[PDB]
Design an enzyme around this catalytic site. Structure first.
Site, PDB file in Angstrom:
ATOM      1  N   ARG A 147      32.825  31.024  29.697  1.00 26.92           N
ATOM      2  CA  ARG A 147      33.469  29.960  30.455  1.00 26.92           C
ATOM      3  C   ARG A 147      33.781  30.402  31.879  1.00 26.92           C
ATOM      4  NH1 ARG A 147      38.638  26.127  28.732  1.00 26.92           N
ATOM      5  NH2 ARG A 147      37.681  26.234  26.643  1.00 26.92           N
ATOM      6  N   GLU A 185      40.931  25.441  32.396  1.00 27.85           N
ATOM      7  CA  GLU A 185      41.631  26.633  31.927  1.00 27.85           C
ATOM      8  C   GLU A 185      40.638  27.730  31.545  1.00 27.85           C
ATOM      9  OE1 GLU A 185      42.639  28.560  28.173  1.00 27.85           O
ATOM     10  OE2 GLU A 185      43.668  26.620  27.954  1.00 27.85           O
ATOM     11  N   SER A 229      44.652  32.163  29.102  1.00 34.47           N
ATOM     12  CA  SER A 229      45.917  31.741  28.515  1.00 34.47           C
ATOM     13  C   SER A 229      46.688  32.967  28.055  1.00 34.47           C
ATOM     14  CB  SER A 229      45.688  30.801  27.340  1.00 34.47           C
ATOM     15  OG  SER A 229      46.838  30.013  27.114  1.00 34.47           O
ATOM     16  N   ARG A 266      35.370  30.120  16.101  1.00 37.14           N
ATOM     17  CA  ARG A 266      36.154  28.890  16.032  1.00 37.14           C
ATOM     18  C   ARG A 266      35.389  27.858  15.215  1.00 37.14           C
TER      19      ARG A 266
END
Lengths: 501, 501
Positions: free
Chosen positions: A475, A424, A427, A266
């Site tokens: 995460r 979160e 997803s 990213r």
């Protein structure tokens, strides 16, 4: 007279040439032959598990010097290996009153690797800091790797739970990350990355046991905004932010159930406690028979299983405890039935608790912030007593082009995010599996179909109903342990200001 | 003109399944007053309960044959296929149903309700030797576009006869999502998953942890000329060719036994049968006690275990047999005790067989080419009757800078390659674990120590004796099955002329 000092220097630097005739010295590995035969060498993990044959006679043990405390005719060495430590005692009344041996031992730098020959026994009062409650009484000690450089910081300091008590030395994130190979030796950091391996293992084995196959798809792409660019033999290419297109193409090929564990990249210029430019994505994609909720509950079971397996058994319990010793946080909590809220329900909850203020005109287009999602996490922790819940039915306008919308309310989509401690972690969605609807939605999003032809063309020879999800590995670990920064759960973190080590 | 009523039958959309027996149907409309939906894999495994009554099964139309009042569908899922029979006589003599079913394009996904019976003479093609008599058939996903080639053509073994059926590599890879539906290609990639699983579980059972290290580098891990470059927020970066430096830093950090399964990227401009610009590396790094051969035997046992597990009965033998039906090749063979040759012995073997002419003082200077590796493989196959063997003691000058040389005979190093069908699959060595020797060797190879300082500094606070190895996943699978091209064992291959899909 100065030859005394040179003789002392000879003693500090003493190289052992025969470990059968000597009791101390720096040794080459090739010279470690006791009575022309192999040495039965133990590590501290074996000792810990056997004790908490080793008690009958002298044994050989290898380890790193965590600490040395010199006390006249005694010297106390803490040996370290992984999460285990053991006190070893040199008492030169028991070593032919060899003062040179003591002098040589006392001069050994911390973190040196030694082979010790000694006898184990259990003291009256055992050292609180060592989780092996036996001590080795040293008969021989040889150094096979000597620390060559002054440490960038002290492990005693890097290991400390961070406090304001007077005399506390903090080691800050920059120093730790800059000297990562030393930072990783703290008991908490070793434990974090064993737990990371454990999450990978549990994830893969759960999926394999449910008839998934592992796939490996390319990270060099011909087409991808927030993506790194590369020159691919005078073509312009990009690094994959997600293997999303390829895992759907595999489902369109008949693979039925696939997962990938692989890096993603990213390029957003974001410097926060949770953003990495490179991380590990756990990706799942699978068919469903008639209802995409079939898969949602499956993914839910997956996480419940991950939670259950991380919290069970001696090894994982000790790993988590060791992390908690330096970084305390309440144990992660989840229910036997996972709460599921729609996006509309979540909005109404936040408005009801006075955390959010929107007109009814504005509730359609509202895009929930990350802070707002943490506020929802607090509300749900208070009312449902869990750190883990699910949000479904996000508005279609807020989800990617490949997300299937509800045909009764096209404004609403068949999408879902999972949350841990209000953040979160997962997803995903039901995918558009009709090539014509997919083309319509790509045009609806003003995307270039020519840059997606290969992907689009994988739907033109029938497509199974399918869904999927992507999960951040580091995460999930961060949030499970309540750690304060994603750089604690990535081995060599990449962020916009860190390309090294 | 009554043709419009006929087209209305061909494009028929069923609107109520209870009251009907055929037609295209949206998945929501599929409510039989719920449905127990079976796939062909479940049927295969249960039959080789379902036979007491009618059942539902979903699948792709692999072949469709129609004449008179009888219709034959071969239904496909993964490597399983089953013949389904439409007989108008048991369906109230409807001819509209026959027309609609016979007009279905190949690859369409259908839900069939039917009765399973064992026929007198089952079809040779279907590995499910039961037949389904079609009580109902609906199509949930209709092929929208003509296929780029026929699966019948793509599945066939290639003959070199003129005008023979031949689907080109180029066409296959440009249409990978159709190409992957052949029985052999599906089987190949199930087997690639199997190799990953066996590898990871062997290491985990031997107390390894999985690590994930970065692929974005500040400096080239290997020679910079073969690395892809990228702009990393105003810095010059590179894609990793190997996780070599980082897995050693983890050993230097005390991780003791680590593996990684992850992409690597290399920028050589070669278009060969075996070179890819991106592939999956299986990497291992671990300590040893006194002799690096401890680790070599461990790596050897790992490969023997992979071969043993691949070659066993059950699922794997079916997968391998399906691959061999299209791409025949002798079974992979390995001995109970793996042959080990020194590099000098291997070269002298090649000399003895007339493949090489070298004087004694030229042997260590000779760098064995890939062709010479294959010639050695043929010699060893004929003399030792195996496809798998090991070479040790490569010359130091021909191995990377981190390779530990033999102190007594420095031109020779403690290094090893493993071979499958005469081609290298594993490369590794005992590592230099002394920071001063490491710096000397870095200078000896004319490398820039400043570009390695973090790596170098990971040795400055002691270093365990350790070794490691790197393994190409796609290449192991290719050599195990004897396939002719590495593009057969990478899902979406990357080479200097292919960035898409």
């Amino acid at each position: 007279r100065e030859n005394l000092k040179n003789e002392a220097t000879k003693v500090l630097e003493h190289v052992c040439e025969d470990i059968n005739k000597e009791s101390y010295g720096f040794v080459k590995i090739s010279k470690m032959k006791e009575n022309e035969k192999e040495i039965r060498l133990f590590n501290l993990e074996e000792i810990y598990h056997s004790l908490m044959h080793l008690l009958q006679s002298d044994i050989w043990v290898r380890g790193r010097i965590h600490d040395i405390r010199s006390k006249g005719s005694l010297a106390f060495i803490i040996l370290r290996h992984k999460l285990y430590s053991m006190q070893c005692i040199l008492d030169i009344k028991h070593n032919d009153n060899d003062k040179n041996m003591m002098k040589w031992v006392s001069n050994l730098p911390l973190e040196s690797i030694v082979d010790i020959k000694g006898k184990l026994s259990k003291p009256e009062v055992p050292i609180d800091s060592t989780n092996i409650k036996y001590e080795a009484h040293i008969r021989k000690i040889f150094c096979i790797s000597k620390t060559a450089k002054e440490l960038p910081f002290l492990l005693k300091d890097a290991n400390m739970k961070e406090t304001n008590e007077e005399g506390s030395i903090k080691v800050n994130q920059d120093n730790r990350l800059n000297n990562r190979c030393v930072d990783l030796r703290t008991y908490a950091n070793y434990s974090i990355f064993c737990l990371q391996s454990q999450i990978c293992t549990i994830f893969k084995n759960f999926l394999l046991e449910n008839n998934f196959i592992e796939i490996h798809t390319p990270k060099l792409l011909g087409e991808s905004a927030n993506a790194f660019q590369i020159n691919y033999f005078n073509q312009k290419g990009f690094l994959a932010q997600s293997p999303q297109l390829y895992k759907q193409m595999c489902i369109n090929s008949g693979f039925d159930r696939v997962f990938e564990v692989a890096p993603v990249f990213r390029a957003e210029n974001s410097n926060t406690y949770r953003h990495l430019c490179e991380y590990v994505s756990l990706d799942v994609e699978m068919t469903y028979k008639y209802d995409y909720l079939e898969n949602v509950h499956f993914y839910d079971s997956m996480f419940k299983h991950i939670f259950t397996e991380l919290s069970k058994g001696g090894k994982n319990e000790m790993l988590i405890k060791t992390v908690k010793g330096q970084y305390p946080c309440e144990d992660f909590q989840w229910l036997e039935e996972t709460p599921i809220f729609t996006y509309e329900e979540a909005i109404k909850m936040l408005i009801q608790h006075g955390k959010l203020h929107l007109k009814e005109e504005e509730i359609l287009a509202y895009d929930m912030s990350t802070d707002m999602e943490k506020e929802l996490g607090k509300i749900v922790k208070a009312s449902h007593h869990t750190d883990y819940y699910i949000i479904i039915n996000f508005p279609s306008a807020l989800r990617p082009f490949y997300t299937m919308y509800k045909e009764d309310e096209p404004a609403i989509s068949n999408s879902y995010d999972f949350f841990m401690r209000g953040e979160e972690i997962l997803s995903g969605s039901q995918r558009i599996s009709d090539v014509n609807l997919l083309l319509e939605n790509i045009k609806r999003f003003n995307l270039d179909a020519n840059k997606l032809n290969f992907y689009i063309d994988s739907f033109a020879y029938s497509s199974y109903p399918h869904s999927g999800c992507g999960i951040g590995l580091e995460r999930v670990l961060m949030l499970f342990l309540g750690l304060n920064n994603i750089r604690k759960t990535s081995l060599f973190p990449r962020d916009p200001k860190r390309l090294i080590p």
